[PDB]
Design a protein around this ligand. Structure first.
Ligand SMILES: [K+]
Ligand SMILES: [K+]
Ligand SMILES: [Mg+2]
Ligand SMILES: [Mg+2]
Ligand SMILES: [Mg+2]
Ligand SMILES: [Mg+2]
Ligand code: NA
Ligand code: NA
Ligand code: NA
Ligand code: NA
Ligand SMILES: [Zn+2]
Lengths: 183, 270, 50, 173, 196, 130
RNA sequence: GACCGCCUCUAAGCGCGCACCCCGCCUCGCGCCCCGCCCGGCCGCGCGCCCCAGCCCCGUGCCCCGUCGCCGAGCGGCCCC
RNA sequence: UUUGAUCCUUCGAUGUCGGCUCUUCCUACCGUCCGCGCGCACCGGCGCGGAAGCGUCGGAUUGUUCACCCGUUCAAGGGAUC
RNA sequence: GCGGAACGGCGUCGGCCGGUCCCGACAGC
């Protein structure tokens, strides 16, 4: 808006949150989650189970902040009420890829990718757990309460598996994200 | 215009200047890093070069042509008479670097160290540590100073000296060295360990072990004033040159109108 | 590979746009190169083993 | 800092035109010398009368009131480095002479056009229901509020005299 | 009397200008906590600028200058020297009246510190402008003592925190005694007629 | 967050310009850069100033939408906002500064002499009783 | 993940990353420090922290280095061997 | 980094080609490093961006710079009073 | 905030001329 741009969202009943100097804390039945936003100039207010974010004098790129901050807050809410689940698919043609979970779901080891000799180890970020799908055959499941940590872990795995110095249109192998959701 | 063919410079510019060493002997600039929790141990020793010889050994080196046969190797012998510990010094890590806290000397000091403190022992008046040895007769002062070190230091070193009377050398004064103590779980353990071997001999058998690797620090052989061909390894000039042929033909371009420090010149070698 | 698996891989490795200026990878319905800001975009060529 | 003038002018009477027609114009200028210069500038171009063939009958300064706030619409043409352009602008002020100052400063800061590069076609007062620009419109409403846009300026201004202070002052808001 | 300035949050150039003017007028000034001074601009641009500055040396002998210091205190001192006629007696005596420190060492921990708000970043830069501390740049170009400075400052800060409560109680007692005392009341009443 | 706002009826303190050191009231808003102020009972005539000169106060006066000069005067005199502002900490400090504004070179000497005594008296008090 | 209901590696935020760059190891090194013999002479008087889209009630204070201040202790610094 | 055009400085003189020797600098990058594209299955090639650390050689004929051929770990181009 | 051109920019601010729009436009009959 010409004088100030603002946007509002709803606070669900199962969730309780506190605000202070742009530090938003959300508590739910899945755990607690905290984020910091003091890197932007914002006015956050809490009134009758609604969060509203306003920026005064929206000039230039300041007009893009309220909506992104609202999206971050809603992601926090949906994480605390019930977490995220990313599913990965192992794609291979000749040499099966062998993946083993170690450290009580806090890490994974990948061996025999393209029949290579070296092995790969990736560590899940704090609050991220990794396990193999019982129903589906060649699947990876990672769950957590923060959408940032799990997607970061999935990107880490995908980048860890990479074929060097060939035609990538023909050599298709590695772990790919096939689904993002909640449950 | 550009030099027609490719070639590298001659010599390493990281060893400049090539001047006579002004340090009395080889000194240990850095000590091995200290890792907490490892067994407490000493890190260095001082000895004298004696000779070289042969050895025949058996090589078990999987993947090489030598894997199951004999080899003749060159070896060097170093004479290592026992060292005597005689002082403790502690340092504190500070924003300005490593700063000493205090140094505590033993009650009694051997003749070689005293000799190290003078230039001519026979004529020199014997006053070094004369007041200190009266104060430190009882253990109280040593205990107080060690308590200070325990409460204020981060790095612990001992001071040991050699015994030239056990060597064929003509020297009678000793060499004094600082040796770091590595390992343990805290500074108190280090201080107690260092105090447990004061005024006592230390054998090289308790410092190094067979099969490990070491660094050696010394001063190379001297040669005096030497020319560029031998000092820097530049090419000799052809036979027809007037005024000799052991030199560098061109020592610079017209501009810059100075001589650069990267050009080879004659001077001290070794 | 199952055909569904090949579909998953290809959407990560085949479907994009290429800038004729700097050769950068761009999203599938972008109008400006993310790097040079130019507009002369292309389509990543399909492999013969379609 | 402009004034507003009403200028009357006429061509000198001739033998075949004993009583020439009279022309009136409204001019905004910093003084009356500039006002007469601009009057002759426009009369030469629009009526083919030069200063040498004519005379100025009266240059009367008119002072406005200046109590309430009104919305002014200004239509102008200016010459850039690539030709000429028309332009409509909206300003909020207490007097029409004060609105011209704002318009000239905005043109200087944004388009780089100076006084003698601009021609003012018409100046009129606009009602709150027929405002064209969004800033003026958003300031014409009722019960409009906002926080101080630059409270750091007060603290900065006082530090020029008190160079060294025993604590960092806060910015009240 | 010596002026002791806490350079936390100050802009390097503006503080240098003020301090140079003070030095030329015959005052002694000390600067503490120089690793917390701020330079405006993205860290990449600042780092590139400083690396470019470090590249100029006498071709035929690098021991002939110019010299490039890496510690934040010496960086600040060089910036100040750039604003002073240091080749004359008048300017050479001015640079001998200046002291610069990283952190707050014991030689200055007992002084009364001041600030210059006209050279502070929260009043001089717009909110969305990038900025960085001289400590990070110094570390990125070769300074060795950042972690030690941080450790010492933490220890000193806790020790100072222990000292504040004793000051609180002593100040309360002194205030009550001053209120009770009669001679001061006369002076205060006399000054109140002038608005002081 | 924000508590004091640029609005109609807000009391304002003038920190710069020809009329610095006086209180006035906002009557209308021109833009985000200028306002129309007026202080009928403090020595400020109706005029337009930039917001860089006006420091916002905590007081707000209830005024008609577009009051005249005389109308606004009774409205101000019917309210206690001014009286309660001068009794605050800021009001007392402003009074003290107004007092300081009138001083010559002879009273500068007297003030300095009294300041010296106060510094000496403080030192003796602190030493005598901790 | 927005401006721009969708889509977007970017606008705020975050990850990975080069025989190049910087540091360590290695060569030189003014000046400093500890200890020994000695146990000396001089000079100075003054500490809250953190943030600026909570700024916790502000928009001060000092303003006399002699202008009458000068003991001791404490703390800090300098000089000599 | 060519050759022209001009005639500002130098005729009480700035020793005028090439080679040999030796140092440093540039990048508009030839191999090696990191990415992307292909009319890229693999091998091998070609294009683009960052990148000047290391490498860029031995010979026959010619005063030659240049050129030309043989060979090898297969062999970029230049500046600094040409 | 390099001397600098043809030619590009969905960087930001300000305009001119045309359409469609609560008789429901644009982006998702
Ligand atoms: K070369
Ligand atoms: K000549
Ligand atoms: Mg000859
Ligand atoms: Mg000559
Ligand atoms: Mg000559
Ligand atoms: Mg390039
Ligand atoms: Na020169
Ligand atoms: Na090395
Ligand atoms: Na040339
Ligand atoms: Na030549
Ligand atoms: Zn592009």
């Amino acid at each position: 808006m010409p004088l100030c741009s603002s946007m509002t969202i709803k606070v669900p009943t199962d969730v309780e949150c506190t605000i202070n100097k742009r530090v938003v804390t959300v508590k739910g039945k899945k755990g607690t989650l905290v984020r910091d936003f003091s890197h932007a100039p914002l006015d956050i207010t809490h009134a009758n189970d609604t969060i509203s974010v306003a920026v005064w004098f929206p000039r230039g790129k300041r007009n893009a902040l309220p909506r992104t901050i609202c999206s971050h807050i809603e992601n926090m809410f949906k994480g605390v009420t019930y977490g995220f689940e990313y599913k990965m698919r192992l794609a291979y043609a000749h040499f099966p890829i062998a993946a083993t979970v170690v450290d009580n779901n806090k890490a994974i080891e990948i061996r025999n990718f393209m029949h290579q000799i070296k092995t790969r180890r990736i560590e899940c970020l704090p609050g991220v757990t990794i396990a193999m799908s019982t129903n589906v055959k060649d699947e990876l499941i990672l769950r957590g309460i923060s959408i940032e940590d799990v997607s970061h872990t999935a990107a880490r795995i995908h980048e860890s598996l990479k074929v060097p110095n060939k035609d990538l249109r023909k050599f298709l192998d590695g772990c790919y994200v096939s689904s993002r959701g909640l449950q | 215009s550009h030099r027609k063919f490719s070639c590298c410079r001659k010599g390493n510019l990281g060893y400049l200047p090539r001047k006579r060493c002004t340090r009395g002997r080889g000194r240990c600039k850095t000590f091995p890093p200290d890792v907490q929790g490892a067994p407490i141990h000493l890190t260095a020793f001082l000895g004298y070069k004696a000779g070289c010889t042969h050895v025949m050994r058996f090589i078990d080196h999987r993947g090489s042509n030598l894997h199951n046969r004999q080899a003749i190797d060159q070896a060097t012998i170093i004479d290592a008479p026992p060292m005597i510990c005689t002082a403790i010094i502690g340092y504190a890590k500070t924003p300005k670097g490593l700063r000493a806290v205090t140094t505590v000397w033993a009650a009694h000091i051997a003749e070689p160290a005293m000799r190290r403190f003078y230039r001519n022992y026979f004529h020199a008046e014997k006053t070094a540590f004369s007041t200190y040895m009266k104060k430190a007769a009882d253990g109280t002062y040593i205990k107080e100073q060690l308590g200070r070190l325990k409460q204020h230091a981060d790095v612990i070193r001992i001071v040991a000296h050699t015994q030239p009377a056990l060597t064929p050398l003509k020297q009678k004064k000793a060499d004094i060295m600082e040796i770091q103590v590595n390992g343990g779980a805290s500074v108190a353990e280090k201080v107690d360990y260092a105090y447990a071997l004061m005024e006592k001999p230390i054998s090289i058998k308790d410092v190094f072990s067979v099969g490990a690797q070491i660094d050696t620090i010394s001063i190379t052989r001297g040669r005096g004033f030497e020319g560029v061909v031998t000092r820097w390894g530049v090419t000799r000039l052809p036979r027809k040159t007037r005024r000799g042929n052991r030199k560098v033909a061109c020592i610079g371009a017209w501009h810059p109108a100075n001589v650069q420090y990267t050009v080879a010149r004659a001077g001290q070698m070794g | 590979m199952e055909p569904t698996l090949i579909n998953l891989a290809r959407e990560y490795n085949q479907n994009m746009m290429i800038c004729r200026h700097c050769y950068a990878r761009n999203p599938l319905r972008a109008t400006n190169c993310r790097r040079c800001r130019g507009t002369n975009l292309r389509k990543k060529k399909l492999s013969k083993y379609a | 800092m402009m004034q507003k003038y009403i200028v009357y002018g006429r061509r000198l009477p001739s033998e075949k035109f004993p009583e020439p027609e009279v022309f009136r114009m409204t001019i905004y200028a910093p003084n009356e010398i500039v006002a007469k210069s601009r009057f002759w500038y426009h009369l030469k171009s629009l009526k083919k009368i030069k200063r040498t063939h004519g005379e100025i009958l009266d240059c009367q300064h008119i002072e406005e009131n200046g109590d309430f706030v009104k919305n002014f619409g200004v239509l102008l043409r200016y010459r850039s480095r690539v030709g000429q352009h028309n332009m409509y602008r909206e300003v909020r002020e207490t007097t029409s002479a004060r609105a011209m100052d704002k318009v000239y400063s905005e043109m200087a800061g944004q388009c780089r056009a100076r006084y003698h590069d601009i021609q003012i076609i018409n100046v009129k007062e606009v009602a709150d229901e027929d405002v064209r620009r969004e800033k003026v419109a958003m300031f014409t409403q009722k019960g409009v509020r906002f926080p101080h846009p630059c409270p750091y300026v007060h603290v900065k201004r006082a530090a020029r005299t008190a160079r060294f202070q025993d604590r960092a002052p806060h910015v009240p808001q | 009397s010596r002026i002791v300035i806490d350079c936390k949050g100050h802009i390097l150039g503006r503080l240098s200008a003020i301090v140079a003017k003070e030095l030329l007028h015959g005052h002694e000034v000390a600067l503490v906590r120089c690793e917390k001074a701020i330079i405006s601009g993205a860290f990449r641009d600042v780092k590139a600028h400083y690396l470019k500055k470090m590249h100029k040396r006498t071709n035929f002998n690098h021991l002939r200058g110019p010299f490039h210091f890496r510690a934040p205190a010496e960086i600040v001192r060089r910036t100040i020297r750039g604003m002073i006629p240091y080749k004359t007696v008048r300017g050479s005596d001015a640079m001998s009246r200046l002291r610069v420190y990283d952190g707050i060492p014991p030689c200055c921990a007992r002084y009364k510190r001041v600030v210059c708000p006209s050279a502070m970043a929260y009043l001089c830069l717009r909110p969305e402008r990038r900025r960085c501390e001289v400590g990070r740049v110094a570390h990125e170009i070769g300074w060795q003592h950042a972690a030690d400075v941080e450790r010492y400052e933490k220890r000193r800060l806790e020790e100072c925190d222990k000292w504040y409560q004793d000051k609180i109680q002593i100040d309360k007692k002194i205030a009550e005694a001053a209120e009770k005392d009669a001679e001061l009341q006369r002076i205060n009443a006399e000054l109140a007629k002038y608005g002081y | 967050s924000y508590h004091r706002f640029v609005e109609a009826g807000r009391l304002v303190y003038l920190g710069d310009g020809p009329d610095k050191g006086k209180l006035a009231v906002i009557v209308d808003i021109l833009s985000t850069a200028a306002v129309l102020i007026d202080g009928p009972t403090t020595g400020v005539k109706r005029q337009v100033v930039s917001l860089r000169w006006a420091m916002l106060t905590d007081q707000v006066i209830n005024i008609s939408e577009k009051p005249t000069t005389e109308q606004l005067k009774k409205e101000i005199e019917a309210s206690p906002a001014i009286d309660t502002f001068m009794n605050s900490v800021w009001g007392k400090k402003i009074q003290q500064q107004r007092l300081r504004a009138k001083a010559t070179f002879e009273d500068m000497g007297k003030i300095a002499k009294l300041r010296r005594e106060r510094k000496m008296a403080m030192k003796r008090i602190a030493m005598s009783i901790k």
